[PDB]
Amino acid sequence: VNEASVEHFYSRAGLVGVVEVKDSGTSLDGYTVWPIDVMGFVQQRRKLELSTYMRFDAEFTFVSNLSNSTTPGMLLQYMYVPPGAPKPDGRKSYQWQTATNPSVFAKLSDPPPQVSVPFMSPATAYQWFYDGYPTNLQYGQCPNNMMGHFAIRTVSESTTGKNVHVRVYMRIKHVRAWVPRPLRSQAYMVKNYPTYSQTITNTATDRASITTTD
Amino acid sequence: VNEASVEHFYSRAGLVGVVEVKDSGTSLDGYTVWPIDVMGFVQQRRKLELSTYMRFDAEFTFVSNLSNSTTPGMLLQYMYVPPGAPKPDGRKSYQWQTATNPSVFAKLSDPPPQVSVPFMSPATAYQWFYDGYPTNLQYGQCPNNMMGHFAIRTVSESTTGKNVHVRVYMRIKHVRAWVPRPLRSQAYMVKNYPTYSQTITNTATDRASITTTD
Amino acid sequence: PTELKPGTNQFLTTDDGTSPPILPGFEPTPLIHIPGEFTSLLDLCQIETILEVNNTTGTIGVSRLLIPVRAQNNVDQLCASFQVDPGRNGPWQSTMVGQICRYYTQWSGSLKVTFMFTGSFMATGKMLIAYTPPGSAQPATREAAMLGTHIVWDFGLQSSVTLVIPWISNTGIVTIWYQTNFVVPPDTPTEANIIALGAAQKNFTLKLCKDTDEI
Amino acid sequence: PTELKPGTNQFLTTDDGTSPPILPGFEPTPLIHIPGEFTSLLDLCQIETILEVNNTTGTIGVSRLLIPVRAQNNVDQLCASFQVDPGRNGPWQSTMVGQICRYYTQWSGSLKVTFMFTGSFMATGKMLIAYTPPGSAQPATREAAMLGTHIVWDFGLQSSVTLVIPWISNTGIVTIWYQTNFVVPPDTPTEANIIALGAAQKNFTLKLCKDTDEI
Amino acid sequence: EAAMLGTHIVWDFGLQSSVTLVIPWISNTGIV
Amino acid sequence: EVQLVESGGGLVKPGGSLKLSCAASGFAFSTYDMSWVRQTPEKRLELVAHISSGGGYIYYPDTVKGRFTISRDNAKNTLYLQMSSLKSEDTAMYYCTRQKGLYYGFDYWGQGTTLTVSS
Amino acid sequence: NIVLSYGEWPEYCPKPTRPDVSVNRFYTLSTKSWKTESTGWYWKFPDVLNDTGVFGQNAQFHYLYRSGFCMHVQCNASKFHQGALLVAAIPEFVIAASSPLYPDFAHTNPGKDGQEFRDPYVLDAGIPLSQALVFPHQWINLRTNNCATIIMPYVNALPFDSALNHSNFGLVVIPISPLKYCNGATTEVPVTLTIAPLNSEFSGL
Amino acid sequence: NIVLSYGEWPEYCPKPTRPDVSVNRFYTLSTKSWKTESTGWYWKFPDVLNDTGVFGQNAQFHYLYRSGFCMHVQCNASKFHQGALLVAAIPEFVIAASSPLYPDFAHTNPGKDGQEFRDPYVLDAGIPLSQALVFPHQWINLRTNNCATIIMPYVNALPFDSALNHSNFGLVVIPISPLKYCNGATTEVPVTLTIAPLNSEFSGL
Amino acid sequence: DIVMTQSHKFMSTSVGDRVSITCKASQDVNTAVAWYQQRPGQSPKLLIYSASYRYTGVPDRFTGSGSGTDFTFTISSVQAEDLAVYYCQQHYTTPHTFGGGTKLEIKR
């Protein structure tokens, strides 16, 4: 009876997205920027749309290693670009320092970094469904949900030969949900819009007749 | 209403300067001395000149690694030369030991060193604007603001082949500000003097007429 | 002066730990009262949602929600039947409790099933709704059904009726029999349609969260 | 007997931690009272600073601070106008509140805008100062303006006047119309100059520190 | 749509078989 | 397809200053880093200056450091090079190139313009 | 008899003007005809009142407002007709497009005349209809009751928001069990609607 | 009417000699003529009193002092002149040089005759003028008031400091709105200044 | 800086033949190197960058290989259009540096 609570139901930490720097091979750029998308996986998306308005603090962790699952010591800079501030142009761009961009310097050898993001939205809660136009690409888009981009880079000075994979985990604390919504039957087409395929799929799997059971 | 406080406004830690030992290539010297300059970056300089007199304790951190962003264990000596004591001549100079020069011995493998400097000035507060001569190069120079040079060197005995970059972060605690000053419109020419370019730049971006808006 | 136990540096996926605030002295936008806050899924299981009892082949859509009933010129016949497992694939997939019981390995508790009658105001008849305990096959003919649990439901008087099933654990059958012919005065549509509504009672419980296959 | 959590050795840029004193037993030079201590930026937003309403092309300098007003031999004309966004590029960049609102992503609260009249003691006239709410275009002619918010400002009597704007969140226009001709006795300069002063009210607030682009 | 903005009453047969409309005023002109 | 043109190059006497301006069309011009490269009469090639895509980072070699200046305008699709105090060795032909980052190879090269420092 | 949405009465939020007076009167929208083939309708107000009455005169010229609605739907049919309707008020109702790409603006804000569903089974929002009872709803069952009434308070994240952009919610009428009538009976059963905004406010003329 | 700088009255700091007596008298500096073309003036005292009076006899022969000032600026013009001045006392006033390198000593300590600004818009310190109101200031507006008065206490880090080196602050008079007058009126409007040091102290003869 | 030196200021071959040029690094550059084609009176084109990988559109007869401080640029089949000066680059670190150049010779 305590596992039906909305607080426990959203509890556990999960994989929000996998990003890669890849500075070694044909792509030498040497950093990456990962806009925070909680909807990333269609499984995590279908449990969120259950509720229309929800207010929660997030907590992150970055599990990193090379392509060998081998983790030698080499330094990484995890920066958090808050919503409304400019993004880094290139691996040396002066945005990588500033002041106001909170950063985390962690070697690979260390156990994974961890950090806690507060509630960033202007409105008193997030909205997963916003009717009406922000001011037809525009229809139903919340401008106020952006949580920031978590730009990453490897401090070591020039062109290491090592592509560094990294995984990003999220978990939701202190969650509070408002008016409920029925779960989605139809498959998803694209990320930001509900649009569903022409051909409809039934909700229940058919049987022989209105009568026969099993 | 708590993010407008002068204490929070100067809070966050930032990059005061980047120094390099470079004992490997054409320059074999093997150490460096970095006079503490809070004004180092024109961004941090424009927020300080907001206030004329201010009194604060500082706290430092040194994030170090090789040119690969690779951090093998090798020993470093971070020494702090207090204001008014002689500087090291060369990597073996007897100043590197003495007594009164507080030092920090930290391997690269360890997480970054950290240390807390007190308030060093004779006067009850720093002065970012001092009129009048200390006794025309002299005009407007505070002799009493020197905070010390943070000389660094790598203990390993002779000519390692490794140039070691190092970054230096500062954050300001317990700050107290006095009489306010308007922000600087004109661009900076040189470090220690206000001197501004001949050609003046307007403060506001012009429009078509006194009338039209947007 | 401490020692480190064997479990030091592991990162455990369900951590329930603490973490540094990334932006100290930041002020979230304060709350205001928003109506409707729901604190637990176990209230949603208690609201009734239309059930697909039809779900046959080629039934297209929005016609799958209702079971047809007409004058079949036969006194004792089996109108429709469906087993009572909420989680198991079948009719109950269209309910609510059907869906959020795909997210939990085990459930329990009583269920409630409600019927409506859409037919015209003049029509009259009798349906015998009979429930079979989970360890038995569905009845042969009503004389076997009326011996078990049942309620005779009459149109002209009672337009909706509720059948509480006693128990389910983690199977049972409810059938709908014609008790009498379907009788109507002249100039009236001859066939009605019955819709069903599933819901869970108060004591329904869930256990051991698990992610689902629906998608 | 302890275990180490996943966040051990990270160096977090906004640390709010503690550090060893490098020189123990050292005595800072003690305080003395210095007048003027200011504890928060939000007092600076409340002092008025000259505003550049002119900011046109080729206006050189120190002439950008004041709007000219003369006898234009026309009764109803638009003297000058400027939108009310403090952060947005424009006139407000010369104020104080204009500058230290470039350091914060969001602001709010009422503003205050004050006018002075520099003309000679003999001169007389009437200006109609009208403010437009943020969701509308600036008025066509005064008959559209005098219907909105406005105050008629008279020279010979009142040499300075204050207009509080009700609200701003993170857009609005204030215009200055000639109500009547500019009337002067003989041997008097024919054109005056009006200067404006912006300031923030008590309830003005700031949020989410950010470094700026001004430099 | 112009009428329902003015004075009006919706009158329903199956329930109410008679209904009364008081006109506010007449002096010595108006339309229903 | 793509066009990199330059201008301003020509004979000049020692000490003078000259602005080489490069103009581009046929691609999105704010998404690429840019650079200058000069080819000595011996055809020895060497770098000149570098700027990031959005103006974040600007790099100068040690020889030209402080003597030159580079800037770009994403609105005008131009790349400007302000260069003064010309010595003898500053004569060579200057190419206007394009990159996707710091360490990517230079894919395109302007037709190049000569420069000459003499009395 | 009456369904208070989410168990609350709409109320003021303690200078915004309170019109009261003549925006508290009922408005009677045009009468939709429910045939045997017809499927669904929806409205999505604050929209429907933007043109009509003195209300639209407030909502067009004000930059912000707060409001709450009392809506009443009744269906006149003789006793020889059968069939049933589902009436539900679904907050934050965002529709979608079918694919073989966004919904045309005529489908987003229909106006006072409502709109027809393309796919009532999925609501044309993608969610199934069987579960749409989770929203506040009332059954109009032509052998029992002919009227359905709902009071929906003001539900939205911000205290105030504009009428020309964010449409606070929507309303659906879906004939779940189709209409049948014996020969000679009237072919169409009319459906009418009535809305009476409660506790409205406006600001920023 | 009177602006106390930073909301305080200058006071003694509880053997330094307190002269009182004849260093409390007003001093009347030479009268500057404000033309239509003229721009700005500044003084930067303790300087201005180093030569004059008995005060300069104290400040030259003492190694340390503490002081505070009451300064009064008034402008005599008939009612047919227009124009306005800004009067502000800006502590720790450090000037700069234009470039196409340091300011000549005549610009650092002008003396009793003040100095003209090269660039009044930027104050020739680099900071904009629009914001210079952040310092204690008073408006002299030739249609309203002809006088401006300021009391500036002793503001400096150390308790005492010498008069020949550190100039505690400065004073500016900038004609923000230029002067215009109809033909025949007097061509120049004079500006005068008066300073009366308060609570002075001296030590180390 | 870091100097990239090429062994041969000239090499001779004929059409259909196979020629391969080297490059030598002042220190360890990892795999970062690039090879350029400068035809007479023309802007030098990019061919092969970062050891083996070749830029989009370069014909397949152009190959390269190496690692560390020793590199190689291989022409499977020489053609007429192949006459021009070649250069090797170091993009491993800033500042970039180019080789002295190598000129082919077709002797008939």
Side-chain angles (χ1 to χ4, degrees), chain F residues 28-39:
Chain F
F29 180 78
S30 64
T31 59
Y32 293 128
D33 295 346
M34 302 297 288
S35 179
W36 292 97
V37 176
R38 64 180 181 188
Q39 188 169 357

PDB file of all heavy atoms in Angstrom, chain F residues 28-39:
ATOM      1  N   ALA F  28      26.386  28.088 -44.744  1.00  0.00           N
ATOM      2  CA  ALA F  28      26.112  28.826 -43.521  1.00  0.00           C
ATOM      3  C   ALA F  28      27.435  29.271 -42.914  1.00  0.00           C
ATOM      4  O   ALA F  28      28.276  28.439 -42.565  1.00  0.00           O
ATOM      5  CB  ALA F  28      25.328  27.961 -42.542  1.00  0.00           C
ATOM      6  N   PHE F  29      27.608  30.579 -42.766  1.00  0.00           N
ATOM      7  CA  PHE F  29      28.913  31.139 -42.462  1.00  0.00           C
ATOM      8  C   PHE F  29      29.166  31.305 -40.976  1.00  0.00           C
ATOM      9  O   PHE F  29      30.303  31.572 -40.582  1.00  0.00           O
ATOM     10  CB  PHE F  29      29.060  32.483 -43.167  1.00  0.00           C
ATOM     11  CG  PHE F  29      30.371  33.158 -42.934  1.00  0.00           C
ATOM     12  CD1 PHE F  29      31.497  32.753 -43.617  1.00  0.00           C
ATOM     13  CD2 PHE F  29      30.469  34.220 -42.064  1.00  0.00           C
ATOM     14  CE1 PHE F  29      32.696  33.378 -43.419  1.00  0.00           C
ATOM     15  CE2 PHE F  29      31.665  34.848 -41.865  1.00  0.00           C
ATOM     16  CZ  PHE F  29      32.780  34.428 -42.542  1.00  0.00           C
ATOM     17  N   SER F  30      28.154  31.145 -40.140  1.00  0.00           N
ATOM     18  CA  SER F  30      28.374  31.261 -38.711  1.00  0.00           C
ATOM     19  C   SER F  30      28.749  29.938 -38.073  1.00  0.00           C
ATOM     20  O   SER F  30      29.100  29.915 -36.891  1.00  0.00           O
ATOM     21  CB  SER F  30      27.129  31.819 -38.027  1.00  0.00           C
ATOM     22  OG  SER F  30      26.047  30.919 -38.157  1.00  0.00           O
ATOM     23  N   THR F  31      28.685  28.847 -38.823  1.00  0.00           N
ATOM     24  CA  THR F  31      28.902  27.515 -38.284  1.00  0.00           C
ATOM     25  C   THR F  31      30.313  26.992 -38.488  1.00  0.00           C
ATOM     26  O   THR F  31      30.577  25.835 -38.158  1.00  0.00           O
ATOM     27  CB  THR F  31      27.908  26.548 -38.909  1.00  0.00           C
ATOM     28  OG1 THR F  31      28.083  26.559 -40.329  1.00  0.00           O
ATOM     29  CG2 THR F  31      26.501  26.988 -38.590  1.00  0.00           C
ATOM     30  N   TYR F  32      31.219  27.789 -39.038  1.00  0.00           N
ATOM     31  CA  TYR F  32      32.554  27.316 -39.364  1.00  0.00           C
ATOM     32  C   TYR F  32      33.609  28.246 -38.799  1.00  0.00           C
ATOM     33  O   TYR F  32      33.508  29.468 -38.926  1.00  0.00           O
ATOM     34  CB  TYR F  32      32.735  27.205 -40.865  1.00  0.00           C
ATOM     35  CG  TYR F  32      31.890  26.135 -41.481  1.00  0.00           C
ATOM     36  CD1 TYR F  32      31.067  26.413 -42.552  1.00  0.00           C
ATOM     37  CD2 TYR F  32      31.868  24.861 -40.955  1.00  0.00           C
ATOM     38  CE1 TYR F  32      30.274  25.443 -43.106  1.00  0.00           C
ATOM     39  CE2 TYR F  32      31.087  23.880 -41.509  1.00  0.00           C
ATOM     40  CZ  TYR F  32      30.289  24.178 -42.581  1.00  0.00           C
ATOM     41  OH  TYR F  32      29.499  23.202 -43.131  1.00  0.00           O
ATOM     42  N   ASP F  33      34.625  27.660 -38.184  1.00  0.00           N
ATOM     43  CA  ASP F  33      35.785  28.442 -37.818  1.00  0.00           C
ATOM     44  C   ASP F  33      36.504  28.890 -39.078  1.00  0.00           C
ATOM     45  O   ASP F  33      36.328  28.322 -40.154  1.00  0.00           O
ATOM     46  CB  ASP F  33      36.723  27.630 -36.943  1.00  0.00           C
ATOM     47  CG  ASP F  33      36.110  27.288 -35.615  1.00  0.00           C
ATOM     48  OD1 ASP F  33      35.079  27.901 -35.272  1.00  0.00           O
ATOM     49  OD2 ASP F  33      36.655  26.410 -34.916  1.00  0.00           O
ATOM     50  N   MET F  34      37.314  29.927 -38.946  1.00  0.00           N
ATOM     51  CA  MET F  34      37.986  30.504 -40.094  1.00  0.00           C
ATOM     52  C   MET F  34      39.437  30.751 -39.730  1.00  0.00           C
ATOM     53  O   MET F  34      39.796  30.787 -38.555  1.00  0.00           O
ATOM     54  CB  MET F  34      37.312  31.805 -40.522  1.00  0.00           C
ATOM     55  CG  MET F  34      35.842  31.648 -40.856  1.00  0.00           C
ATOM     56  SD  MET F  34      35.490  30.582 -42.255  1.00  0.00           S
ATOM     57  CE  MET F  34      36.051  31.624 -43.585  1.00  0.00           C
ATOM     58  N   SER F  35      40.277  30.921 -40.745  1.00  0.00           N
ATOM     59  CA  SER F  35      41.684  31.167 -40.472  1.00  0.00           C
ATOM     60  C   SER F  35      42.338  31.819 -41.678  1.00  0.00           C
ATOM     61  O   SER F  35      41.792  31.809 -42.782  1.00  0.00           O
ATOM     62  CB  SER F  35      42.407  29.877 -40.107  1.00  0.00           C
ATOM     63  OG  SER F  35      43.774  30.138 -39.878  1.00  0.00           O
ATOM     64  N   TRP F  36      43.512  32.398 -41.449  1.00  0.00           N
ATOM     65  CA  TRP F  36      44.350  32.921 -42.515  1.00  0.00           C
ATOM     66  C   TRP F  36      45.651  32.140 -42.572  1.00  0.00           C
ATOM     67  O   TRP F  36      46.172  31.698 -41.547  1.00  0.00           O
ATOM     68  CB  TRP F  36      44.663  34.400 -42.322  1.00  0.00           C
ATOM     69  CG  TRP F  36      43.494  35.296 -42.479  1.00  0.00           C
ATOM     70  CD1 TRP F  36      42.715  35.791 -41.488  1.00  0.00           C
ATOM     71  CD2 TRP F  36      42.967  35.816 -43.699  1.00  0.00           C
ATOM     72  NE1 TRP F  36      41.733  36.587 -42.009  1.00  0.00           N
ATOM     73  CE2 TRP F  36      41.866  36.614 -43.369  1.00  0.00           C
ATOM     74  CE3 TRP F  36      43.316  35.674 -45.038  1.00  0.00           C
ATOM     75  CZ2 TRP F  36      41.116  37.271 -44.322  1.00  0.00           C
ATOM     76  CZ3 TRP F  36      42.568  36.328 -45.983  1.00  0.00           C
ATOM     77  CH2 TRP F  36      41.482  37.116 -45.622  1.00  0.00           C
ATOM     78  N   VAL F  37      46.176  31.975 -43.780  1.00  0.00           N
ATOM     79  CA  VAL F  37      47.428  31.263 -44.008  1.00  0.00           C
ATOM     80  C   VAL F  37      48.215  32.013 -45.070  1.00  0.00           C
ATOM     81  O   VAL F  37      47.662  32.375 -46.112  1.00  0.00           O
ATOM     82  CB  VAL F  37      47.187  29.814 -44.459  1.00  0.00           C
ATOM     83  CG1 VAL F  37      48.497  29.152 -44.780  1.00  0.00           C
ATOM     84  CG2 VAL F  37      46.456  29.040 -43.396  1.00  0.00           C
ATOM     85  N   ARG F  38      49.499  32.239 -44.823  1.00  0.00           N
ATOM     86  CA  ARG F  38      50.346  32.949 -45.768  1.00  0.00           C
ATOM     87  C   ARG F  38      51.449  32.035 -46.272  1.00  0.00           C
ATOM     88  O   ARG F  38      51.994  31.228 -45.516  1.00  0.00           O
ATOM     89  CB  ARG F  38      50.960  34.190 -45.143  1.00  0.00           C
ATOM     90  CG  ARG F  38      51.895  33.922 -44.008  1.00  0.00           C
ATOM     91  CD  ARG F  38      52.427  35.218 -43.480  1.00  0.00           C
ATOM     92  NE  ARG F  38      53.358  34.996 -42.391  1.00  0.00           N
ATOM     93  CZ  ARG F  38      53.865  35.967 -41.644  1.00  0.00           C
ATOM     94  NH1 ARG F  38      53.512  37.223 -41.862  1.00  0.00           N
ATOM     95  NH2 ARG F  38      54.709  35.678 -40.667  1.00  0.00           N
ATOM     96  N   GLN F  39      51.778  32.169 -47.551  1.00  0.00           N
ATOM     97  CA  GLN F  39      52.746  31.308 -48.213  1.00  0.00           C
ATOM     98  C   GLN F  39      53.943  32.146 -48.624  1.00  0.00           C
ATOM     99  O   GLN F  39      53.845  32.970 -49.538  1.00  0.00           O
ATOM    100  CB  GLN F  39      52.120  30.621 -49.418  1.00  0.00           C
ATOM    101  CG  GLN F  39      52.997  29.569 -50.034  1.00  0.00           C
ATOM    102  CD  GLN F  39      52.252  28.741 -51.043  1.00  0.00           C
ATOM    103  OE1 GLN F  39      51.054  28.925 -51.244  1.00  0.00           O
ATOM    104  NE2 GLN F  39      52.949  27.809 -51.677  1.00  0.00           N
TER     105      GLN F  39
END
